[PDB]
């Protein structure tokens, strides 16, 4: 797992998507991102033991990652107005989170720099667009990732 490596998101909600790894955070989780134009996955936190690293590499040394995003930037906050039970679902999960102008700003700042490095490879934008899967003919103990 080196900066610029392709990872497979097996246990996530994406169930086997190929993403690009940027850098390691301070809490021990990997901060990856797939080009939203290629695969609809934003800047996501993943676990080290929960990903498969492919031997492919991408020149990403000039990533210029911001410093404002950290482990505290990726959190799940839940709030409710009433203490007892009611008909509405806490007034929060009914209208799911749609925070913008900050989740899209950094994303548009990073993908406009990542895409010129991915589009240089002859067949990488399709490889990342595709979804990994186990067919009947191959086994992981013999497959080379």
């Amino acid at each position: 797992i080196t900066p610029g490596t392709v990872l497979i998101i097996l246990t996530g909600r994406h169930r086997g998507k190929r993403v690009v790894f940027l850098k390691q955070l301070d809490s021990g989780l990997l901060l990856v991102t797939g080009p939203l134009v290629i695969n609809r996955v934003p800047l996501r936190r993943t676990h080290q033991k929960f990903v498969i690293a492919t031997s492919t590499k991408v020149d990403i040394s000039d990533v210029k990652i911001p410093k404002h995003l950290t482990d505290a930037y990726f959190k799940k906050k839940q709030l409710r107005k009433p203490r007892h039970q009611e008909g509405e679902i806490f007034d929060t999960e009914k209208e799911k989170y749609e925070i913008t102008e900050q989740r899209k700003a950094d994303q548009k700042a990073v993908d406009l720099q990542i895409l010129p490095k991915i589009k240089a490879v002859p067949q990488l934008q399709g490889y990342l667009r595709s979804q990994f899967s186990l067919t009947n003919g191959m086994y992981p103990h013999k497959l080379v990732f």
Binding site: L10, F132, L134, Y139, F145
Partner: protein, 109 residues
Amino acid sequence: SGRLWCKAIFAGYKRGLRNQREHTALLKIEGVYARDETEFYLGKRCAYVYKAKNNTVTPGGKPNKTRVIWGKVTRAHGNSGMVRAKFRSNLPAKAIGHRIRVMLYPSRI
């Protein structure tokens, strides 16, 4: 899309000849027929998935008739690629000859 786990068959529990040990189960994973090939699957999680008549809650989505018993691979068994496993609860005897999907959640390589 596509399968994200390896196929394995439940042949029986760890046993001698006149006694059984239900705490440890034996798995015959497809594609592995040698001792030097099962080192990749050591520590991988395993799931025995079946269906019942009463729908139970699922982590994602509405309740479903699906019920799963979790476990993981402990060590190797013999020279023919057979492997061992230990689940949270012992496997029912009706699962002999059925499929336990070996996930790839704990990844080392």
